[PDB]
Ligand binder design. Sequence first.
Ligand SMILES: [Ca+2]
Ligand SMILES: [Ca+2]
Ligand SMILES: [Ca+2]
Ligand SMILES: [Ca+2]
Ligand SMILES: [Ca+2]
Ligand SMILES: [Ca+2]
Ligand SMILES: [Ca+2]
Ligand SMILES: [Ca+2]
Length: 456
Amino acid sequence: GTSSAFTQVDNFSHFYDRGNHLVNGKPSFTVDQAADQLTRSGASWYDLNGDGVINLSYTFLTSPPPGYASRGLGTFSSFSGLQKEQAKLSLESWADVAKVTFTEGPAARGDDGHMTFANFSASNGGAAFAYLPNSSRKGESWYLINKDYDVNKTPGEGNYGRQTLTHEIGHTLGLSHPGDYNPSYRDAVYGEDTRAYSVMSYWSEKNTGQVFTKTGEGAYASAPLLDDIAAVQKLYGANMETRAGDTVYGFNSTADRDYYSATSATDKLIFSVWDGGGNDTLDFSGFSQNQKINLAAGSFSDVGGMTGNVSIAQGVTIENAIGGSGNDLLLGNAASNILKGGAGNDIIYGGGGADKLWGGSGSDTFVYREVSDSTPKAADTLMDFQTGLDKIDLTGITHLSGLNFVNAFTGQAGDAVVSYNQASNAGSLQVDFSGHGVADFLITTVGQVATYDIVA
Ligand SMILES: [Ca+2]
Ligand SMILES: [Ca+2]
Ligand SMILES: [Ca+2]
Ligand SMILES: [Ca+2]
Ligand SMILES: [Ca+2]
Ligand SMILES: [Ca+2]
Ligand SMILES: [Ca+2]
Ligand SMILES: [Ca+2]
Protein backbone atom coordinates (compact mmCIF):
# COMPACT_ATOMS: atom_id res chain seq x y z
CA GLY A 1 0.00 0.00 0.00
CA THR A 2 0.96 3.70 -0.13
CA SER A 3 -0.73 6.91 1.10
CA SER A 4 -3.51 8.57 -0.90
CA ALA A 5 -1.23 11.55 -1.79
CA PHE A 6 1.16 9.06 -3.51
CA THR A 7 -1.78 7.20 -5.21
CA GLN A 8 -3.03 10.58 -6.50
CA VAL A 9 0.26 11.54 -8.03
CA ASP A 10 0.73 8.07 -9.45
CA ASN A 11 -2.77 7.90 -10.95
CA PHE A 12 -2.51 11.43 -12.42
CA SER A 13 0.97 10.62 -13.84
CA HIS A 14 -0.72 7.64 -15.58
CA PHE A 15 -4.17 9.06 -16.28
CA TYR A 16 -3.42 10.03 -19.92
CA ASP A 17 -1.06 7.13 -20.79
CA ARG A 18 -1.06 6.14 -24.46
CA GLY A 19 -0.19 3.02 -26.40
CA ASN A 20 -0.52 -0.70 -25.73
CA HIS A 21 -4.15 -0.64 -24.42
CA LEU A 22 -7.69 -0.12 -25.56
CA VAL A 23 -9.46 3.27 -25.46
CA ASN A 24 -13.21 3.19 -26.22
CA GLY A 25 -12.66 -0.31 -27.66
CA LYS A 26 -10.06 1.16 -30.08
CA PRO A 27 -6.27 0.78 -30.10
CA SER A 28 -4.54 3.53 -28.15
CA PHE A 29 -1.90 5.36 -30.26
CA THR A 30 1.17 7.09 -28.72
CA VAL A 31 1.98 10.60 -29.87
CA ASP A 32 4.42 9.11 -32.43
CA GLN A 33 1.88 6.70 -33.79
CA ALA A 34 -0.74 9.44 -34.05
CA ALA A 35 1.85 11.76 -35.76
CA ASP A 36 2.43 8.99 -38.42
CA GLN A 37 -1.30 8.49 -38.80
CA LEU A 38 -1.70 12.32 -39.45
CA THR A 39 1.06 12.18 -42.03
CA ARG A 40 0.07 8.85 -43.69
CA SER A 41 -0.25 10.37 -47.17
CA GLY A 42 3.51 11.12 -47.23
CA ALA A 43 2.61 14.40 -48.93
CA SER A 44 4.82 17.36 -48.17
CA TRP A 45 6.24 20.58 -49.46
CA TYR A 46 9.89 20.44 -50.57
CA ASP A 47 12.60 22.91 -49.78
CA LEU A 48 13.03 23.84 -53.38
CA ASN A 49 15.60 26.61 -52.85
CA GLY A 50 17.73 24.85 -50.13
CA ASP A 51 17.45 27.72 -47.73
CA GLY A 52 16.54 25.33 -44.92
CA VAL A 53 12.89 26.28 -44.44
CA ILE A 54 9.73 25.64 -46.43
CA ASN A 55 9.04 29.17 -47.56
CA LEU A 56 5.48 29.60 -48.71
CA SER A 57 3.61 32.69 -50.00
CA TYR A 58 -0.19 33.01 -49.73
CA THR A 59 -2.91 35.18 -51.25
CA PHE A 60 -6.32 36.13 -49.97
CA LEU A 61 -7.98 35.76 -53.41
CA THR A 62 -10.08 38.85 -54.33
CA SER A 63 -11.87 37.14 -57.22
CA PRO A 64 -12.67 33.54 -58.33
CA PRO A 65 -9.58 31.62 -59.53
CA PRO A 66 -9.62 29.98 -63.04
CA GLY A 67 -11.67 26.73 -62.90
CA TYR A 68 -13.68 28.04 -59.93
CA ALA A 69 -17.01 28.20 -61.77
CA SER A 70 -17.07 24.51 -62.80
CA ARG A 71 -16.37 23.36 -59.22
CA GLY A 72 -20.05 23.73 -57.95
CA LEU A 73 -18.89 25.86 -54.95
CA GLY A 74 -21.68 28.50 -55.35
CA THR A 75 -20.86 32.25 -54.76
CA PHE A 76 -17.21 33.17 -54.28
CA SER A 77 -16.22 35.86 -51.78
CA SER A 78 -12.96 37.09 -50.33
CA PHE A 79 -11.80 37.02 -46.78
CA SER A 80 -12.94 39.87 -44.55
CA GLY A 81 -10.37 41.84 -42.53
CA LEU A 82 -11.18 39.70 -39.42
CA GLN A 83 -10.75 36.48 -41.38
CA LYS A 84 -7.39 37.76 -42.65
CA GLU A 85 -6.22 38.80 -39.23
CA GLN A 86 -7.22 35.39 -37.73
CA ALA A 87 -5.75 33.45 -40.72
CA LYS A 88 -2.34 35.12 -40.05
CA LEU A 89 -2.52 34.21 -36.32
CA SER A 90 -3.20 30.54 -37.34
CA LEU A 91 -0.30 30.65 -39.88
CA GLU A 92 1.95 32.10 -37.16
CA SER A 93 1.08 29.25 -34.77
CA TRP A 94 2.23 26.59 -37.40
CA ALA A 95 5.38 28.58 -38.19
CA ASP A 96 6.16 28.70 -34.42
CA VAL A 97 6.46 24.93 -34.22
CA ALA A 98 8.07 23.80 -37.52
CA LYS A 99 10.53 25.17 -40.19
CA VAL A 100 7.88 26.57 -42.42
CA THR A 101 7.42 30.28 -43.09
CA PHE A 102 4.53 32.15 -44.67
CA THR A 103 4.68 35.50 -46.45
CA GLU A 104 1.60 37.17 -47.99
CA GLY A 105 2.05 37.73 -51.73
CA PRO A 106 1.42 36.10 -55.14
CA ALA A 107 3.33 33.03 -56.37
CA ALA A 108 7.02 33.91 -57.20
CA ARG A 109 10.18 32.28 -58.43
CA GLY A 110 11.86 31.85 -55.01
CA ASP A 111 8.78 30.26 -53.30
CA ASP A 112 8.71 26.62 -52.26
CA GLY A 113 4.98 26.85 -52.61
CA HIS A 114 1.93 29.06 -52.76
CA MET A 115 -1.33 29.03 -50.81
CA THR A 116 -4.73 30.65 -51.34
CA PHE A 117 -7.62 31.47 -49.01
CA ALA A 118 -11.21 32.21 -50.02
CA ASN A 119 -14.89 31.66 -49.19
CA PHE A 120 -17.55 29.65 -50.99
CA SER A 121 -21.30 29.44 -50.40
CA ALA A 122 -22.49 25.93 -51.43
CA SER A 123 -23.22 23.92 -48.27
CA ASN A 124 -22.53 20.68 -50.14
CA GLY A 125 -18.84 21.50 -49.64
CA GLY A 126 -18.93 21.06 -45.79
CA ALA A 127 -17.67 23.82 -43.38
CA ALA A 128 -14.26 24.09 -45.03
CA PHE A 129 -11.92 22.09 -47.16
CA ALA A 130 -8.30 22.11 -48.28
CA TYR A 131 -5.84 20.19 -50.47
CA LEU A 132 -2.48 18.49 -49.68
CA PRO A 133 0.83 19.59 -51.14
CA ASN A 134 1.07 16.71 -53.62
CA SER A 135 -2.22 17.72 -55.36
CA SER A 136 -2.89 19.81 -58.46
CA ARG A 137 -4.77 22.21 -56.17
CA LYS A 138 -1.94 22.26 -53.59
CA GLY A 139 -2.03 25.32 -51.26
CA GLU A 140 -5.71 26.00 -51.64
CA SER A 141 -8.05 26.21 -48.71
CA TRP A 142 -11.70 27.11 -48.80
CA TYR A 143 -14.18 28.29 -46.20
CA LEU A 144 -18.02 28.05 -46.18
CA ILE A 145 -19.99 31.22 -45.75
CA ASN A 146 -23.74 31.26 -46.39
CA LYS A 147 -27.10 32.00 -44.72
CA ASP A 148 -27.09 28.72 -42.82
CA TYR A 149 -23.53 28.70 -41.57
CA ASP A 150 -21.78 31.79 -40.20
CA VAL A 151 -19.05 30.27 -38.03
CA ASN A 152 -16.40 31.23 -40.54
CA LYS A 153 -17.48 34.84 -40.55
CA THR A 154 -16.36 35.35 -36.98
CA PRO A 155 -13.11 33.42 -36.19
CA GLY A 156 -11.62 34.40 -32.77
CA GLU A 157 -9.26 32.66 -30.34
CA GLY A 158 -11.01 29.76 -28.62
CA ASN A 159 -13.87 29.49 -31.19
CA TYR A 160 -14.62 27.08 -34.07
CA GLY A 161 -13.87 29.61 -36.80
CA ARG A 162 -10.36 29.96 -35.53
CA GLN A 163 -9.70 26.23 -35.17
CA THR A 164 -11.10 25.68 -38.68
CA LEU A 165 -8.45 27.92 -40.07
CA THR A 166 -5.69 26.16 -38.13
CA HIS A 167 -7.17 22.78 -39.24
CA GLU A 168 -7.41 23.56 -42.91
CA ILE A 169 -3.88 25.04 -42.96
CA GLY A 170 -2.79 21.75 -41.31
CA HIS A 171 -4.15 19.98 -44.49
CA THR A 172 -2.28 22.34 -46.77
CA LEU A 173 0.90 21.43 -44.92
CA GLY A 174 0.27 17.66 -45.54
CA LEU A 175 -1.85 16.54 -42.56
CA SER A 176 -4.73 14.13 -42.90
CA HIS A 177 -7.67 13.59 -40.53
CA PRO A 178 -6.75 11.05 -37.86
CA GLY A 179 -8.93 8.65 -39.82
CA ASP A 180 -10.55 7.98 -43.15
CA TYR A 181 -14.05 8.23 -41.71
CA ASN A 182 -22.86 10.11 -41.21
CA PRO A 183 -19.25 9.74 -39.95
CA SER A 184 -18.88 9.86 -36.08
CA TYR A 185 -16.22 9.14 -33.45
CA ARG A 186 -17.37 5.49 -33.73
CA ASP A 187 -15.52 5.42 -37.10
CA ALA A 188 -12.18 6.54 -35.51
CA VAL A 189 -9.19 4.18 -36.02
CA TYR A 190 -7.60 4.94 -32.68
CA GLY A 191 -9.04 6.15 -29.34
CA GLU A 192 -7.14 9.55 -29.28
CA ASP A 193 -8.87 10.85 -32.42
CA THR A 194 -10.47 13.82 -30.63
CA ARG A 195 -10.03 17.56 -30.38
CA ALA A 196 -8.11 17.17 -27.13
CA TYR A 197 -5.14 15.61 -29.13
CA SER A 198 -5.32 17.11 -32.60
CA VAL A 199 -6.99 20.13 -34.28
CA MET A 200 -7.25 17.71 -37.25
CA SER A 201 -9.96 15.66 -35.44
CA TYR A 202 -13.62 16.60 -35.66
CA TRP A 203 -14.67 14.64 -32.60
CA SER A 204 -15.47 16.18 -29.31
CA GLU A 205 -12.92 15.78 -26.54
CA LYS A 206 -15.88 14.48 -24.55
CA ASN A 207 -15.25 11.13 -26.31
CA THR A 208 -12.04 10.68 -24.45
CA GLY A 209 -13.34 12.03 -21.15
CA GLN A 210 -11.77 15.55 -21.18
CA VAL A 211 -13.92 18.38 -19.87
CA PHE A 212 -13.52 21.77 -21.67
CA THR A 213 -17.20 22.91 -21.44
CA LYS A 214 -20.43 21.69 -19.96
CA THR A 215 -21.66 20.53 -23.41
CA GLY A 216 -18.49 19.02 -25.02
CA GLU A 217 -18.65 21.96 -27.58
CA GLY A 218 -17.72 25.01 -28.29
CA ALA A 219 -14.43 25.72 -26.68
CA TYR A 220 -11.69 24.84 -29.16
CA ALA A 221 -7.90 24.93 -29.34
CA SER A 222 -6.74 27.77 -31.55
CA ALA A 223 -3.29 26.39 -32.29
CA PRO A 224 -1.73 22.99 -33.13
CA LEU A 225 -2.21 20.48 -30.30
CA LEU A 226 0.18 17.76 -29.11
CA ASP A 227 -0.14 15.26 -32.01
CA ASP A 228 -0.26 18.06 -34.69
CA ILE A 229 3.02 19.47 -33.37
CA ALA A 230 4.73 16.08 -33.63
CA ALA A 231 3.22 15.42 -37.14
CA VAL A 232 4.30 18.69 -38.61
CA GLN A 233 7.77 18.52 -37.03
CA LYS A 234 8.16 15.01 -38.53
CA LEU A 235 7.64 16.56 -42.02
CA TYR A 236 9.62 19.82 -41.68
CA GLY A 237 11.86 19.77 -38.54
CA ALA A 238 11.22 21.52 -35.19
CA ASN A 239 11.50 25.35 -35.07
CA MET A 240 13.94 25.54 -32.10
CA GLU A 241 14.24 29.36 -32.32
CA THR A 242 10.73 29.86 -30.99
CA ARG A 243 10.47 31.04 -27.37
CA ALA A 244 14.07 29.90 -26.86
CA GLY A 245 14.71 32.36 -23.94
CA ASP A 246 12.94 32.07 -20.56
CA THR A 247 9.16 31.98 -21.21
CA VAL A 248 6.14 32.08 -18.98
CA TYR A 249 2.84 30.46 -20.13
CA GLY A 250 -0.52 31.24 -18.61
CA PHE A 251 -0.93 34.20 -16.24
CA ASN A 252 1.83 36.78 -16.54
CA SER A 253 2.57 35.25 -19.97
CA THR A 254 5.64 36.27 -21.97
CA ALA A 255 4.78 33.84 -24.82
CA ASP A 256 2.95 36.65 -26.80
CA ARG A 257 0.19 34.44 -28.15
CA ASP A 258 -3.41 34.86 -27.46
CA TYR A 259 -3.93 31.10 -26.89
CA TYR A 260 -1.11 30.90 -24.28
CA SER A 261 -2.27 33.95 -22.30
CA ALA A 262 -4.62 33.86 -19.30
CA THR A 263 -5.72 37.08 -17.71
CA SER A 264 -8.86 36.16 -15.80
CA ALA A 265 -9.94 33.49 -13.29
CA THR A 266 -12.62 32.51 -15.90
CA ASP A 267 -10.29 32.06 -18.93
CA LYS A 268 -10.56 28.70 -20.75
CA LEU A 269 -7.13 27.52 -21.86
CA ILE A 270 -6.64 24.81 -24.49
CA PHE A 271 -3.07 24.57 -25.75
CA SER A 272 0.00 22.39 -26.22
CA VAL A 273 3.27 24.09 -25.30
CA TRP A 274 5.99 24.29 -27.96
CA ASP A 275 9.14 25.95 -26.61
CA GLY A 276 12.63 25.93 -27.93
CA GLY A 277 14.81 26.49 -24.82
CA GLY A 278 15.43 28.51 -21.66
CA ASN A 279 14.08 28.36 -18.12
CA ASP A 280 10.32 28.25 -18.54
CA THR A 281 7.24 28.38 -16.28
CA LEU A 282 3.61 27.30 -16.40
CA ASP A 283 1.99 30.02 -14.22
CA PHE A 284 -1.55 28.95 -13.30
CA SER A 285 -1.61 31.14 -10.17
CA GLY A 286 -4.70 33.09 -11.30
CA PHE A 287 -7.20 30.17 -10.97
CA SER A 288 -9.08 29.05 -7.91
CA GLN A 289 -10.24 25.55 -9.01
CA ASN A 290 -8.25 22.41 -8.05
CA GLN A 291 -5.54 21.83 -10.73
CA LYS A 292 -3.26 19.03 -11.74
CA ILE A 293 -0.17 20.15 -13.50
CA ASN A 294 2.31 17.79 -15.15
CA LEU A 295 5.66 19.02 -16.45
CA ALA A 296 6.56 15.79 -18.23
CA ALA A 297 7.09 16.31 -22.03
CA GLY A 298 4.12 14.82 -23.85
CA SER A 299 1.87 14.93 -20.78
CA PHE A 300 -1.49 16.45 -20.03
CA SER A 301 -2.72 18.72 -17.21
CA ASP A 302 -6.17 19.73 -15.92
CA VAL A 303 -6.04 23.53 -15.82
CA GLY A 304 -8.35 26.23 -14.68
CA GLY A 305 -11.34 24.05 -13.82
CA MET A 306 -11.07 22.02 -17.04
CA THR A 307 -9.39 18.57 -17.56
CA GLY A 308 -6.90 17.37 -20.24
CA ASN A 309 -6.72 20.92 -21.61
CA VAL A 310 -3.04 21.81 -21.40
CA SER A 311 -0.12 19.63 -22.61
CA ILE A 312 3.54 19.96 -23.30
CA ALA A 313 4.86 18.94 -26.77
CA GLN A 314 7.27 16.08 -27.14
CA GLY A 315 10.79 17.18 -27.12
CA VAL A 316 10.08 20.15 -24.73
CA THR A 317 11.54 20.76 -21.26
CA ILE A 318 9.49 23.10 -19.09
CA GLU A 319 11.19 23.67 -15.69
CA ASN A 320 8.72 25.35 -13.31
CA ALA A 321 5.04 25.28 -12.43
CA ILE A 322 2.90 27.53 -10.17
CA GLY A 323 -0.47 26.37 -8.90
CA GLY A 324 -3.42 28.55 -7.87
CA SER A 325 -5.44 28.99 -4.68
CA GLY A 326 -7.01 25.58 -5.12
CA ASN A 327 -5.85 22.14 -3.74
CA ASP A 328 -3.40 21.20 -6.54
CA LEU A 329 -1.12 18.41 -7.79
CA LEU A 330 2.10 19.61 -9.29
CA LEU A 331 4.33 17.04 -10.91
CA GLY A 332 7.90 17.84 -12.00
CA ASN A 333 10.09 16.07 -14.53
CA ALA A 334 13.66 14.78 -14.64
CA ALA A 335 15.06 18.34 -14.63
CA SER A 336 15.45 20.61 -11.58
CA ASN A 337 12.07 22.12 -11.17
CA ILE A 338 10.69 24.99 -9.27
CA LEU A 339 7.23 23.92 -8.11
CA LYS A 340 5.06 26.44 -6.23
CA GLY A 341 1.76 25.23 -4.82
CA GLY A 342 0.36 28.56 -3.76
CA ALA A 343 -2.68 28.81 -1.43
CA GLY A 344 -4.75 25.69 -0.67
CA ASN A 345 -3.46 22.24 0.22
CA ASP A 346 -1.10 21.07 -2.38
CA ILE A 347 0.72 17.82 -3.34
CA ILE A 348 4.09 18.38 -4.97
CA TYR A 349 6.17 15.75 -6.74
CA GLY A 350 9.65 16.82 -7.76
CA GLY A 351 10.68 13.60 -9.49
CA GLY A 352 14.21 13.39 -10.79
CA GLY A 353 16.85 16.00 -9.99
CA ALA A 354 17.39 18.52 -7.21
CA ASP A 355 14.10 20.41 -7.09
CA LYS A 356 13.11 23.51 -5.09
CA LEU A 357 9.61 23.01 -3.81
CA TRP A 358 7.26 25.57 -2.30
CA GLY A 359 4.06 24.53 -0.65
CA GLY A 360 2.81 28.08 -0.06
CA SER A 361 0.15 28.48 2.63
CA GLY A 362 -2.12 25.53 3.64
CA SER A 363 -1.06 21.93 4.49
CA ASP A 364 1.16 20.76 1.67
CA THR A 365 2.59 17.37 0.93
CA PHE A 366 5.83 16.61 -0.82
CA VAL A 367 5.75 13.24 -2.54
CA TYR A 368 8.56 10.84 -3.31
CA ARG A 369 8.35 7.90 -5.70
CA GLU A 370 11.89 6.68 -6.12
CA VAL A 371 14.99 6.97 -3.95
CA SER A 372 16.53 8.78 -6.99
CA ASP A 373 14.03 11.63 -6.51
CA SER A 374 16.29 13.21 -3.78
CA THR A 375 19.79 11.83 -3.25
CA PRO A 376 22.80 13.19 -1.29
CA LYS A 377 24.46 14.59 -4.47
CA ALA A 378 21.19 16.04 -5.82
CA ALA A 379 18.81 16.79 -2.96
CA ASP A 380 15.50 18.67 -3.09
CA THR A 381 15.07 21.76 -0.96
CA LEU A 382 11.69 22.28 0.61
CA MET A 383 11.93 26.09 0.54
CA ASP A 384 9.01 26.93 2.84
CA PHE A 385 8.53 23.77 4.89
CA GLN A 386 6.17 24.23 7.89
CA THR A 387 6.86 21.59 10.62
CA GLY A 388 3.64 20.23 12.22
CA LEU A 389 1.77 21.37 9.11
CA ASP A 390 3.33 20.04 5.92
CA LYS A 391 4.24 16.35 5.26
CA ILE A 392 7.13 14.63 3.48
CA ASP A 393 5.48 11.48 2.02
CA LEU A 394 7.92 8.49 1.29
CA THR A 395 5.22 5.82 1.10
CA GLY A 396 5.73 5.19 -2.68
CA ILE A 397 9.26 4.15 -1.80
CA THR A 398 8.58 2.31 1.55
CA HIS A 399 5.16 0.84 0.67
CA LEU A 400 4.22 1.57 4.22
CA SER A 401 7.12 -0.40 5.82
CA GLY A 402 7.94 2.64 7.97
CA LEU A 403 11.31 4.07 9.00
CA ASN A 404 13.44 3.61 12.08
CA PHE A 405 14.56 7.00 13.41
CA VAL A 406 18.18 6.84 14.70
CA ASN A 407 21.06 9.23 15.36
CA ALA A 408 23.28 7.52 12.80
CA PHE A 409 22.94 4.67 10.35
CA THR A 410 23.15 1.23 11.89
CA GLY A 411 23.13 -0.91 8.81
CA GLN A 412 19.39 -1.65 8.97
CA ALA A 413 17.14 -0.94 5.94
CA GLY A 414 14.83 1.92 6.59
CA ASP A 415 17.11 3.72 9.12
CA ALA A 416 16.54 7.53 8.95
CA VAL A 417 18.13 10.54 10.65
CA VAL A 418 16.44 13.91 10.94
CA SER A 419 18.69 16.77 12.01
CA TYR A 420 18.35 20.48 12.28
CA ASN A 421 21.32 22.73 11.56
CA GLN A 422 20.67 25.82 13.77
CA ALA A 423 23.48 27.66 11.94
CA SER A 424 21.65 27.77 8.60
CA ASN A 425 18.09 27.11 9.77
CA ALA A 426 18.27 23.96 7.59
CA GLY A 427 16.44 20.77 8.41
CA SER A 428 17.55 17.54 6.82
CA LEU A 429 16.03 14.05 6.50
CA GLN A 430 18.59 11.40 5.42
CA VAL A 431 17.34 7.87 4.76
CA ASP A 432 19.13 4.60 4.19
CA PHE A 433 16.54 2.62 2.35
CA SER A 434 18.90 -0.16 1.26
CA GLY A 435 20.51 -0.60 4.67
CA HIS A 436 24.12 -0.22 3.67
CA GLY A 437 24.97 2.13 6.51
CA VAL A 438 25.18 5.43 4.56
CA ALA A 439 22.33 7.71 3.38
CA ASP A 440 21.07 6.95 -0.07
CA PHE A 441 18.39 9.63 0.14
CA LEU A 442 18.51 13.26 1.38
CA ILE A 443 15.99 16.12 1.54
CA THR A 444 16.94 19.52 2.96
CA THR A 445 14.31 21.87 4.39
CA VAL A 446 14.19 25.57 5.14
CA GLY A 447 13.00 25.45 8.78
CA GLN A 448 12.92 22.41 10.96
CA VAL A 449 11.67 18.94 10.10
CA ALA A 450 10.35 16.53 12.69
CA THR A 451 9.73 12.75 12.72
CA TYR A 452 5.97 13.49 12.86
CA ASP A 453 6.30 15.48 9.57
CA ILE A 454 7.25 12.26 7.74
CA VAL A 455 4.81 9.77 6.17
CA ALA A 456 6.38 6.33 5.49
CA1 LIG B 1 12.94 26.98 -48.92
CA1 LIG C 1 11.47 29.23 -23.55
CA1 LIG D 1 13.08 24.95 -20.93
CA1 LIG E 1 -2.64 25.63 -4.65
CA1 LIG F 1 12.50 17.30 -11.07
CA1 LIG G 1 -0.29 25.33 -0.52
CA1 LIG H 1 2.53 24.96 3.57
CA1 LIG I 1 13.76 15.67 -7.05
